[PDB]
């Protein structure tokens, strides 16, 4: 569906965030998915690997309690050591490529803190009945 | 689980809608999933393709904001040009096979309008904090 895709990258993170489905809709089907085991086996291998990549990201969102929707609020505070910019500065003057580089150092830390959704689920059961 | 399956098709859409899980539970495992690369390779290829088909439909529901549940309200109005029948007329006198043929012409249009869930998510963030 190259009606629009990574062209979102030409603008700011704020603007790009309004078209997230544009890329999502292009992540599950390569040319081989639209369409002598020699050579042909590679197409089979590629399809399998594409599936695995997709599912790994979905599993991570599941674990974090962010499965479903494009945007997920986490209830985990942002650390002051991760960046030092105005919120509006990053959303209006930075692109996603720039942002990803700027906070690459904290990827594992941030993800580790998203394990807190597990504590939230225990609390919710106790007060839910 | 052929305890019941496509027999739902013998009745109206209304009646059939009460047994949607009956078919869903039969979509992930063929005989080869219950159980010399020559010939046997076909079973491997089939299992992979079945997975891909499943995931593509799930991804579409994800994009539309309809991931989870059998029935999803969209907040997208129905066009008067798509059909001209009483709501009760289609639910009580038509089958799903008949219905699918009747509105086949609008499949892409309807799906394109389900992209509106993206606008809803942006609005929700802005007023959610």
């Amino acid at each position, epitope marked *: 569906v190259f*009606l*629009g895709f990574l*062209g*979102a990258a*030409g*603008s700011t993170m704020g*603007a790009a965030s309004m*078209t997230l489905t*544009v890329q999502a809709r292009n992540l599950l089907s390569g040319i081989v998915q639209q369409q002598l085991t020699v050579w042909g086996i590679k197409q089979l291998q590629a399809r399998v690997l594409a599936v695995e990549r997709y599912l790994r990201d979905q599993q991570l969102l599941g674990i974090w309690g962010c499965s479903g929707k494009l945007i997920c609020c986490t209830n985990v505070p942002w650390n002051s050591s991760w960046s030092n910019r105005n919120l509006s500065e990053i959303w209006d003057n930075m692109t996603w490529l720039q942002w990803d580089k700027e906070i690459s150092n904290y990827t594992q830390i941030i993800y580790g803190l998203l394990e807190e959704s597990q504590n939230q689920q225990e609390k919710n059961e106790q007060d839910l009945l | 689980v052929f305890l019941g399956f496509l027999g739902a098709a013998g009745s109206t859409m209304g009646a059939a809608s009460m047994t949607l899980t009956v078919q869903a539970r039969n979509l992930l495992s063929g005989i080869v999933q219950q159980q010399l690369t020559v010939w046997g390779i076909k079973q491997l290829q089939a299992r992979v393709l079945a997975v891909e088909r499943y995931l593509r439909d799930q991804q579409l529901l994800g994009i539309w904001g309809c991931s989870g549940k059998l029935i999803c309200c969209t907040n997208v109005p129905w066009n008067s040009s798509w059909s001209n029948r009483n709501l009760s007329e289609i639910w009580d006198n038509m089958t799903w096979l008949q219905w699918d043929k009747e509105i086949s012409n609008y499949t892409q249009i309807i799906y394109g309008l389900l*992209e509106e869930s993206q606008n809803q998510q942006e609005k929700n963030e802005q007023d959610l904090l």
Partner: antibody
Amino acid sequence: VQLVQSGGALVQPGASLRLSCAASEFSFSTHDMHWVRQAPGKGLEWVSGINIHGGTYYPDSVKGRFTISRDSAKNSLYLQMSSLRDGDTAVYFCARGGKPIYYSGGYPSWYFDLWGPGTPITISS
Amino acid sequence: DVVMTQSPGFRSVTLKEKVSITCQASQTIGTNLHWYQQKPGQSPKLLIKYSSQSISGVPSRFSGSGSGTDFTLTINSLEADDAATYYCQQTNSFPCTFGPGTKVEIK
């Protein structure tokens, strides 16, 4: 439905000029808008454009000299040009991008359904 | 860049003649070609989109087709009101480009 345009002008080389268009009976907030120019004896050179999310596009032939902007509150479009040359003499037009075949986000279809009347600019000594 | 040419430079035609002009691209543009017309003193109008799609407001006598590098515009029966310069534009590759146009004169 139309694109209401400003009148023409004569400026000296090196001059700056602002052009504008307005939406009659529609909202600019629902469409991607573009400017083109027609030099005497020529066809329509695309000059600039802005999408529905405020993202922009420019030709290298004007990039750095021309700026496109929108103010949806008043249904108006603007084209601001600096350091104009005699070679930029043309009729300038606004046009409403044609509806795309399938959703793209803020990525234009690059063809037009609605054209304005044309606003000439002459640049000379 | 996609270089577009048109042929003939102009066409001399008479009323009720079935007529045609063509457009060519230096490189394939798939089916992403659109036809426009302009009369002297007038703003441009779009008549055909995506090689062969019709547009409301365009008479049924206008039609066309093409792909790759070769496209054709035709009029089933030429009317006096059809005198215009006709143009092709491509949207396949940025920058968008257009051809020089073909003038159709009616006698």
